[PDB]
């Protein structure tokens, strides 16, 4: 994801047709590294709803109103 | 971010059809892939490898690595590119061959040059090299490295191909994307999960997602069209309809309590049709003061392709009586579970020509006739009564007709005598057939259906032929082959219970059992194919003409409409009948006024007097001489009707060599 | 009752039938089985030496491959009662005084079958007898593929068709129709139409083999089954099983 | 009865079979051998787990005369976790709030208790029941077996971890509240978290919400690993159902037994491989992902023995599997086929044009080579992986047609192609059919005694097939005469002396894949012929091994044949002399074949045989020994008649299984004769690059899947058809008290039909599963393999029968039903039917002690087989007789079993209902179980229960009961007059635990029967000493735990095991 852009920028800081230092595709195994996403939020649960949306609908589940 | 949905897919195209709303989801930051070419070059990848292979090294790919192929002339052409004008060869080259190519007037009698070239592979200068020995898999897992990659074949899948040399010496992303192919290589890459793999109208995406789904089911990232809605937020075609399925339920309220019975599903109705309806997810009564269904439930059944139920599996054709055994009375409907669309148009219906409906003795036809009579749409009719001709008609013109021809068949069995007799016989209490019995009246009623009734049905669908293109109903398969009809031959049946409609209907003229038993008769007579859903000829009816008015509505009925018909020269001693009509927008019919309608030609006998009180008409006959009409010559964007009688603005009138004469405004 | 429901556009037949057509679908499943395991038919080579609309008179031979494919096994490895220079013999020794001959001929032989009774049951014999050798693996030119079955009544599932038999598919709705000629006279003018049948064409080459095979197939499950099935008089009865059509029929073409 | 025979129509259309397999099944399992599907094991749920929903039945009276609106939290819109009505029951709803990834097309769902519920219990075997009302009381334990497995079935789900919120409201301290998905979610949160409502009034709930403990709300636990990374599990409080908590712990524990990591995965497709091609695994803290893979022994071992049960004397199923192994052999071999180098050694054979024969000619007609050979010779080294199932031997038309003489030339070339071809070939019988070949070839010129008239020297070869028409001359070298028959005599020494040696060459893992041969140890395969490991990679032409020394022999012989004194002087020396040139030359031809058997291909068969949709399945080789030819390789599926042990009733129950395949011995000798390389051949190089884009797929990963589900499912059918049968397995029953039929053949094996549906249609799956079992007789099952040898000594396997989670689960299920039978709308015990007239307020569901009475209370009659009515004369009373033998009026204390009243329902009703409803007695009819209904009345008004109780009366019949009707008063919150009410029906045991809360949103109840908020279910709040863990489960459910929701990610191989090109 993220090492493709830079070595696109790579190849465009050269102006060659592919480029020479690769970040992406190396002999190393890196399938247990994490990018800083924005999926997770800073409790440690996802982010299929917003935060503030979440705060809404806990507070708006208990609220009173005028008796008629 | 990338999901992938069950139909094909272009940037250009899709997003013109939408083609995301189509499957229920509310919607920038959607873009679209070309997924048009890939389904081509799977179909060309098919003939020669197996599946197996295919499909898995297609599933291993994503669609956001962009990269593309490269193919090139195979050796001898390939060093004779680089003997040519450009001296374009790569610093992979032998030191010595460069140097024996940069020379000028090289031939055979070189043999410095072709000691080496018989030692050149091309493997040795570009790496890596798809040959034709190459596995599929290989082929993706080297395409998702570097970006371009070179072969020697043109059956590869996957991305572009693009040529190396002239062919004289051959033989932009965004955040949410969509395809039609479910990729595997990222963590996260979705499926939608709408449609399940039984209605997927392509054939080879369906070939795909069943071996996709087949072992790869625990591994997919699965998404819903509610959770894709929530993702996301925080000329126009005819013949392509949404269809849903009603997920429905029987209840029966005695008194009071109510209580549920079955939990039934009907398959295939479009969504147009409950949009104009306009039924929700409540209850209803399905019957009238008499006990008919009120007239739009019975619609929605005869325009489904099926109608099952959910705990078991197996058919369920409902009661259309009232007597309880099982009376379907209330129904509650509780959603729609799929949506996807389906090319109205079926495959049979290739050039305009009668159509022949096979539907079976005790179906509905009391009540479609009166239905669909009364539609009407547009400035035209969509299905008149004097275009549709019962099955009935066909056995009348006779000396004493074939229904009181095979009910005198019981003189000539043993101990058969008094036709109550003969039906107490055949049947026993439960009115299913013995199975002896009802062959050996067969062996009798055989030759008085093939010997008499044949020839002149022969006769009678040869003068349907000439006066006009009409509808044909008939009770069995047979009935129109061994006479020889003209015209698509369409073998259909209803979600109902036959039979029991022959127990219902009174005023019968006969036994109402023997018309029971001549009902089996049919049905032993025809052959043994599997008829195809009233719906799918009843979509075709109705749902594009409903489609159209919402595009073509209130611009001009003037330019907005136009007909097709035989033309005869005004030189005549004492003109231009109709043949089709078809309304469209004004850049449709523009090009409809193209596409000249010579290279067509009748013969038309029209004589007759004034009948009506309509003006001036002649029922004529024309009897089309040369090749039929196809319905691409007319279009895929113009609706056409498809029975018409034949008439024409005294005298007499003799064999005219008619032509065609596409009128507009 | 002795027909399940479509595998596509083919009904199968279920082998609990009371009919006698189970014995003509048993033969013609039999030889689509031991054709498709022959090691020849899976080569490019002799793809592309098998490979090397309307009718009229004054493209079938593409996708009609395995009918006739599996007629040749049947006329020549299954029942050898066909001869297709050696039929003098024949008639000379069946001629003699002490053996009698039958000549039994067959009325309307290009008339004769049709989907009712035959087709039907040889196009459900040959898409089942060929899906279990070759799975996937495809014909000369046309892909593998799949459609949806109800097969057996209780669930429905989708079932890859297997690319020889995706032919079958695409043939099955040829036959099921019939055919259309078209037709111009010199000796009339103004007569000129088509018309449509269940009929063969008159001359044809495939249209022989097949018909000998139905033919050869037929004689002998009379000779085995409806034979004493259907006779008292036990000297008819011992005539009847007494000879088979290996040891005495000899057929050419109707 | 014109219009009774359409009911009789529809009524005998409706009967239709389920079940449509007449049909052939043999095309589909070939399709299913050759690639099955994996079932659907991991789901995701990210709603909360519960199946019983709190239903309101009769609404609260909010406007009234005694108490102010303003009182109740109704009238301020305040969202209570609780339905604020008069009347709440607890019902049975699976999957809601549950936003699942896909149904797994089960679900029990239950009307409230005042409609109408038989639908659930008529759904089973009640073909032949007229009335939509009514099910078959024989078929009750049935009805409740398949719900307990729908049940069961639609709770197989994994808990997902959504997202938190702390709140900002002041209504806990700061805790941390779950936020679910889906379109509309602020209401959940009043249901979920009942603690967070404010407590504003002395309402039952504001009562109930208050005495309870505060800091048990939302998140109390979780696990950080990483900054900014999901949290793997956490540990919430919220409402929740223990029972449905306590399946899916179980469905976890064996998903995380199931589990592997990829280090693993990398050493062992390292050792699949051989070292041909390594793969890697990264060295970094995991981001704790689940990967089911690790099963154990015995489940691969039953797959195996159901697919050797599915190839049952065919030859069609397991032809395109050998067919299949050509291809892939095919594609990895390096040899190939070079057809021109016999007729380029040809043609300096040194012979006269004057001769008619042509020694060099003759054997390029007998032996042509058409470069289709090698598809009849990998088909032949791919069968050497089955010889319990597959025996290749030479086609019938390969023998010489009738014997042929030796003095005739093209025979003795057809000897020579037998004779190099049969040591290819698995067949037992190989060595007297190449003994027999010359054997026939000589009769007249050489003879050797036989055994009998029958296999005489003339019988032809092909004949011999069984291990026992071997002549005694054979295994006697002694008695082939060496001046009468020396030739033969050499021929049989060559036999005994050169034939080739079996041997075995140590393929697979053991660690991840389950081993899964029987009858072998595992990772060992067992080869006809004998290898050696090459120590160069740069291979070359060489002559000492096995096949070479084979066909040199044979030449050898031939020499004898031909240098003969018999044999020589019919021929010249011209010809003498070629054909002598033709054999020295035929003997030193130089190809790879002997080679490659030799050195490289039980090295790639190794490669292969893992990574294979059909395991290996052998039985040992033996060469030229009579006493160890195996015969009648047999699997078992049933027992029989009382013998429950599967050792002891394994030899005279089982069926027979393997077939012969026909091959050609042209193909297979040109294949021998004919092999070259390629020009610079490296094999770490070859097979490095050939064998890498094998090593990429995940199938053998998928069938691993597959094997837990054919294993699971044949413990679910035993331990379900026991509760029902009369099996042999220790099993536990529960379901006693419900009545049921004496169940047969028929009626189990259409039972199991229904619980493997229901087993497929979960899982998604579409072909295929435990119908082999289902086939015969599935009351008494079993599973065994045997084989024995010639001399009838007996190997057998018994493979255990290992863990099932279903079957726990489903007898969990059914422990907790034997304590909550209401909840699925069952009761227990009998009714009474008898007038009861007053206006107390008592519920029928609890009835008073006083009205009840068994067979222990004094002065009781009771009815049994005997039921003879007597009429009445002048005046008399009628009379109907006892069991003892007395003859009592129509008067008192009955109890009649309900049979005896279905079986009479119509001559009962004349005589009895008249009396039931005005005067003084009263029947009690044992059921045993019965579903009911729950008509309510207001208490304030007459209420006469008689048009209910004759409906339900008059409906019984020899098929089936409707469900029983009651009357509940309905209970209020001040005081009301009372009005009389008259009931006939009441319960006999308690039947009043499906009741919830009476008056919830009110102060108290004063009238009717009243119930609070039930204490003992929610026992984490209004206990303060109990852990947050505890649950009470076999005897209630609890409605509310700590349940823990994984974040788990579920990756595929090829994400995280690279390959390194």
Same mark, same amino acid.
């Given at each position: 994801?993220? @090492? ?8 465009? =800081?050269? #102006?060659?047709?592919?480029? *020479?230092?690769?970040? !992406? ?5 890196? @399938? ?8 997770? =939020?800073? #409790?440690?649960?996802?982010? *299929?709803?917003?935060? !503030? ?16 | ?665 | ?254 | ?1061």
């Amino acid at each position: 994801d993220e @090492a493709d852009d830079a070595t696109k920028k790579q190849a465009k =800081d050269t #102006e060659k047709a592919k480029a *020479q230092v690769t970040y !992406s595709d190396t002999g190393i195994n890196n @399938a247990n590294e994490l990018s800083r996403s924005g999926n997770v =939020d800073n #409790e440690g649960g996802s982010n *299929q709803k917003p935060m !503030s949306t979440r705060i809404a609908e806990a507070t708006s589940a208990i609220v009173s109103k005028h008796p008629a | 971010a990338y999901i992938a949905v069950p139909a094909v897919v272009d940037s250009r195209s899709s997003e013109a059809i939408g083609l995301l709303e189509s499957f229920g989801v509310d919607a920038n930051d959607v873009s679209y892939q070309d997924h048009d070419y890939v389904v081509d070059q799977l179909q060309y990848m098919l003939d020669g490898y197996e599946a197996g292979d295919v499909i898995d090294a297609l599933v291993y790919r994503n669609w956001l690595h962009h990269s593309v192929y490269c193919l090139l002339p195979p050796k001898s052409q390939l060093l004779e590119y680089w003997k040519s004008n450009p001296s374009v060869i790569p610093d992979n080259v032998d030191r010595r061959l460069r140097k024996r190519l940069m020379l000028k007037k090289d031939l055979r009698k070189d043999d410095e040059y072709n000691q080496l070239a018989r030692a050149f592979k091309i493997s040795d200068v570009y790496a890596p090299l798809i040959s034709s020995t190459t596995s599929p898999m290989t082929m993706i897992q080297n395409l998702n490295q570097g970006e371009i990659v070179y072969t020697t074949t043109d059956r590869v899948i996957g991305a572009r191909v693009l040529l190396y040399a002239p062919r004289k010496y051959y033989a932009p992303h965004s955040r949410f994307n969509v395809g039609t192919f479910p990729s595997i290589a990222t963590p996260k890459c979705s499926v939608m999960s709408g449609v399940d793999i039984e209605s997927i109208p392509n054939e080879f995406i369906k070939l795909f997602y069943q071996r996709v789904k087949s072992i790869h089911a625990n591994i997919l990232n699965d998404i819903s069209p509610q959770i894709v809605s929530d993702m996301i937020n925080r000329h126009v075609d005819v013949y392509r309809v949404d269809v849903v399925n009603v997920l429905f339920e029987v209840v029966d309220v005695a008194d009071g309590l109510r209580s549920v019975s079955r939990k039934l599903i009907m398959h295939t109705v479009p969504v147009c049709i409950l949009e104009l309806l306009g039924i929700e997810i409540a209850d209803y009564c399905i019957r009238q003061e008499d006990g008919m269904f009120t007239d739009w439930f019975l619609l929605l059944t005869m325009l489904s392709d099926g109608l099952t139920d959910r705990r078991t599996h197996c058919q369920y054709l409902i009661n259309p009586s009232s007597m309880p055994p099982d009376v379907i009375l209330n129904i509650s409907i509780t959603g729609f579970i799929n949506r996807h669309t389906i090319d109205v148009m079926p495959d049979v219906y290739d050039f305009i020509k009668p159509i022949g409906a096979v539907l079976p003795k005790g179906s509905f036809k009391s009540t479609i006739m009166r239905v669909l009579d009364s539609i009407s749409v547009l400035g035209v009719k969509i299905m008149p009564r004097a275009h549709v001709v019962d099955s009935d008609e066909v056995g009348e013109q006779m000396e004493p007709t074939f229904e009181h021809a095979v009910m005198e068949i019981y003189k000539g069995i043993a101990g058969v005598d008094s036709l109550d007799d003969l039906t107490k016989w055949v049947l026993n209490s439960d009115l299913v057939p013995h199975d002896d019995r009802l062959g050996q009246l067969f062996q009798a009623f055989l030759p008085l259906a093939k010997d008499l009734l044949a020839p002149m049905a022969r006769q009678f669908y040869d003068n349907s032929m000439s006066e006009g293109r009409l509808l044909t109903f008939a009770h069995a398969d047979s009935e129109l082959l061994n006479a020889n009809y003209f015209g698509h031959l369409l073998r259909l049946k209803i979600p109902y219970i036959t039979e029991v409609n022959l127990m219902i209907r009174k005023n019968r003229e006969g036994g109402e059992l023997f018309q029971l038993v001549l009902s089996y008769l049919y049905k032993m007579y025809a052959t043994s194919a599997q008829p195809k859903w009233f719906g799918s000829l009843l979509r075709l009816l109705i749902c594009p003409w409903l489609h159209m008015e919402k595009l073509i509505g209130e611009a001009d009925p003037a330019s907005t409409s136009a007909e097709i018909g035989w033309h005869v020269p005004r030189e005549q001693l004492m003109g231009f009948i109709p043949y089709v009509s078809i309304r469209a927008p004004r850049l449709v019919i523009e090009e409809l006024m193209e596409k000249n309608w010579g290279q067509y030609h009748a013969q038309v006998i029209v004589t007759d007097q004034l009948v009506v009180g309509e003006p001036r008409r002649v029922s004529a006959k024309a009897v089309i001489k040369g090749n039929h009409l196809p319905v691409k010559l007319i279009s895929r964007f113009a609706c056409f009707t498809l029975t018409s009688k034949y008439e024409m603005r005294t005298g007499r009138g003799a064999a005219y060599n008619a032509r065609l004469a596409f009128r507009s405004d | 009752k002795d027909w399940t429901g479509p595998i596509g556009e083919i009904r199968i037949l279920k082998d609990t039938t009371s009919s006698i057509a189970r014995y003509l679908y048993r033969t013609w499943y039999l030889a689509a089985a031991r054709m498709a395991a022959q090691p020849r038919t899976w080569d490019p080579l002799f793809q592309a030496i098998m490979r090397s609309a309307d009718t009229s008179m004054g493209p079938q031979q593409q996708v009609s491959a395995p009918h006739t494919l599996t007629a040749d096994y049947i006329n020549y490895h299954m029942n050898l009662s066909t001869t297709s220079e050696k039929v003098i013999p024949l008639g000379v020794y069946a001629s003699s005084p002490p053996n009698q001959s039958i000549n039994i001929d067959i009325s309307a032989c290009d008339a004769s079958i049709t989907w009712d009774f035959f087709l039907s049951v040889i196009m459900a014999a040959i898409h089942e007898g060929v899906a279990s050798s070759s799975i996937g693996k495809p014909f000369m030119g046309v892909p593998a593929s799949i459609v949806n079955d109800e097969s057996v009544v209780g669930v429905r599932a989708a079932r890859p068709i297997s690319g020889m038999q995706n032919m079958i598919q695409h043939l099955s709705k040829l036959y099921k129709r019939g055919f259309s000629y078209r037709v111009n006279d010199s000796f009339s003018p103004g007569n000129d139409f088509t018309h449509m049948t269940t009929t063969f064409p008159s001359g044809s080459t495939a249209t022989s083999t097949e018909h000998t095979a139905n033919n050869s197939t037929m004689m002998e499950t009379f000779l085995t089954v409806w034979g004493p099935e259907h006779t008292d008089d036990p000297d008819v009865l011992r005539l009847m099983k007494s000879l088979t059509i290996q040891r005495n029929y000899v057929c050419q073409g109707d | 009865e014109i219009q009774r025979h359409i009911t009789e129509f529809i009524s005998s259309w409706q009967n239709h079979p389920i079940v449509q397999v007449s049909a052939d099944v043999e095309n589909r399992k070939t399709a299913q051998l050759l690639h099955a599907d994996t079932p659907r094991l991991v789901t995701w749920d990210a709603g909360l787990c519960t199946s019983f929903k709190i239903v309101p039945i009769v609404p609260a009276q909010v406007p009234q005369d005694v108490l102010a609106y303003t009182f109740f939290t109704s009238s301020y819109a305040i969202q209570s976790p609780f339905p604020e009505a008069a009347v709440s029951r607890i019902v049975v709803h699976t999957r809601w709030a549950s936003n699942v990834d896909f149904d797994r097309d089960s679900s029990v769902i239950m009307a409230p208790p005042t409609e109408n519920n038989i639908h659930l219990f008529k759904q089973l075997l009640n073909t032949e029941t007229l009335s939509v009302r009514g099910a078959n009381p024989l078929m009750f334990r049935a009805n409740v077996l398949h719900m307990l497995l729908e049940f069961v079935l639609d709770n197989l789900y994994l808990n997902r971890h959504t997202g938190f919120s702390q709140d900002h409201t002041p209504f806990t301290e700061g805790a941390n509240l779950r936020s679910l998905p889906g379109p509309d979610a602020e209401k959940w949160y009043s249901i979920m978290y009942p603690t967070r409502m404010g407590t504003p009034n002395v309402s039952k709930i504001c009562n109930f919400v208050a005495s309870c403990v505060r800091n048990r709300v939302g998140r109390f636990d979780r696990a950080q690993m990483m900054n900014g990374a999901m949290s793997e599990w956490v540990d919430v409080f919220e409402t929740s159902d223990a029972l449905t908590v306590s399946i899916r712990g179980r469905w976890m524990a064996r998903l995380a037994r199931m589990n592997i990591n990829p280090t693993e995965i990398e050493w062992a497709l390292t050792e699949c491989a051989q070292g041909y091609v390594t793969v890697t695994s990264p060295y970094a803290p995991s981001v704790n992902r689940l990967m089911p893979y690790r099963i154990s022994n015995a489940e691969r071992q039953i797959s195996q023995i159901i697919r050797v049960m599915n190839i049952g004397n065919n030859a069609t199923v397991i032809q395109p599997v050998l067919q299949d192994i050509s291809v892939l052999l095919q594609r990895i071999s390096p040899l190939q086929i070079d057809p021109t180098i016999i007729s380029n050694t040809m043609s300096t054979v040194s012979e006269s044009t004057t001769q008619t024969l042509s020694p060099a000619s003759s054997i390029l007609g007998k032996l042509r080579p058409s470069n289709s050979d090698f598809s009849s010779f990998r088909v032949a080294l791919a069968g050497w992986l089955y010889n319990g199932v597959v025996t290749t031997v030479i086609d019938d038309s390969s023998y010489p047609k009738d014997g042929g003489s030796v003095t005739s030339l093209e025979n003795l070339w057809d000897f020579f192609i037998l004779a190099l071809a049969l040591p290819l070939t698995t067949d037992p019988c190989a060595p007297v059919k190449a003994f027999m070949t010359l054997a026939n070839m000589m009769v007249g010129f050489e003879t050797i005694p036989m055994d009998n008239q029958i296999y005489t020297q003339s019988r032809r070869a092909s004949a011999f097939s069984t291990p026992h028409t071997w002549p005694r001359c054979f295994m006697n070298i002694q008695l082939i005469s060496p001046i009468d028959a020396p030739i033969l005599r050499q021929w049989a020494e060559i036999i005994h002396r050169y034939w080739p040696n079996p041997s075995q060459i140590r393929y697979g893992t053991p660690n991840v894949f389950g081993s899964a041969n029987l009858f072998t140890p595992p990772e060992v395969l067992l080869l006809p012929i004998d290898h050696q490991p090459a120590n160069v990679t740069t291979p070359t032409l060489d002559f000492t091994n096995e096949l070479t020394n084979w066909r040199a022999r044979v030449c050898e012989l031939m020499k004898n044949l031909v240098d003969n004194q018999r044999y020589q002087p019919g021929w010249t020396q011209s010809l003498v002399s070629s054909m002598r040139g033709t054999l020295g030359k035929l003997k030193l031809i130089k190809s790879m074949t002997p080679m490659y058997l030799q050195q490289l291909a039980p090295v790639e068969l190794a490669v292969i045989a893992p990574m294979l949709p059909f395991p290996p399945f052998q039985v040992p080789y033996v060469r030229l020994d009579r006493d160890r030819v195996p015969t009648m390789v047999g699997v078992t599926r049933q027992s029989r008649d009382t013998i429950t042990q599967p050792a002891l009733s394994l030899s005279t129950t089982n069926t027979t299984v393997g077939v012969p395949l026909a091959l050609d011995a042209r193909a297979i000798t040109v294949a021998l004769l004919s092999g070259k390389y390629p020009p610079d051949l490296v094999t770490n190089v070859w097979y490095a690059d050939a064998i890498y884009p094998m090593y990429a797929d995940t199938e053998v990963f998928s069938n691993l899947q597959r094997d837990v589900i054919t294993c699971e499912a044949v413990q679910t059918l035993v331990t379900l058809v026991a509760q029902i049968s009369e099996t042999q397995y220790p099993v536990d029953r529960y379901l006693d008290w419900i009545p049921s039929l004496r169940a047969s053949a028929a009626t189990a094996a259409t039972f199991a039909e229904w619980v493997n549906t229901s087993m497929k249609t979960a899982f998604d799956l579409s072909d295929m599963l435990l119908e082999p079992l289902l086939s015969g007789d599935p009351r008494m099952t079993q599973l065994a393999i045997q084989y024995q040898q010639y001399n009838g000594r007996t190997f057998n396997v018994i493979p255990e029968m290992p863990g099932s989670v279903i079957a726990d689960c489903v007898q969990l299920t059914a422990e907790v039903f034997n304590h909550e039978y209401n909840l699925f709308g069952i009761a227990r015990g009998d009714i009474i039917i008898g007038r009861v007239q007053s206006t107390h307020l008592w519920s029928p569901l609890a009835p008073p002690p006083d009205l009840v009475f068994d067979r222990d209370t004094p002065g009781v009659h009771i009815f049994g087989r005997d039921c003879r009515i007597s009429f009445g004369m002048n005046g008399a009373a009628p009379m109907i007789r006892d069991e003892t033998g007395m003859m009592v009026p129509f008067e008192g204390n009955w109890i009649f079993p309900l049979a005896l009243w279905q079986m009479n329902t119509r001559y009962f009703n004349q005589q009895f209902d008249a009396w039931i409803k005005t005067g003084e007695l009263r029947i009690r009819i044992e059921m045993g179980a019965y579903p009911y209904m729950l008509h309510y009345y207001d208490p304030r008004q007459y209420a006469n229960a008689w048009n209910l109780t004759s409906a339900w009366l008059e409906e019984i019949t020899p098929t089936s009961i409707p469900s029983v009707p009651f009357m509940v008063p309905i209970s209020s919150d001040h005081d009301i007059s009372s009005a009389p009410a008259v009931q006939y029906i009441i319960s006999t045991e308690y039947n009043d635990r499906s009741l919830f809360c009476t008056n919830s949103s009110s102060p108290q109840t004063i009238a009717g029967p009243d119930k609070h908020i039930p204490v003992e279910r929610y026992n984490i709040l209004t206990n303060p000493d109990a852990p947050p863990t505890q649950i009470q489960l076999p005897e209630v459910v609890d409605l509310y735990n700590v349940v823990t929701r994984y974040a788990y990610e579920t990756p595929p191989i090829t994400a995280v095991v690279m390959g390194v090109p």
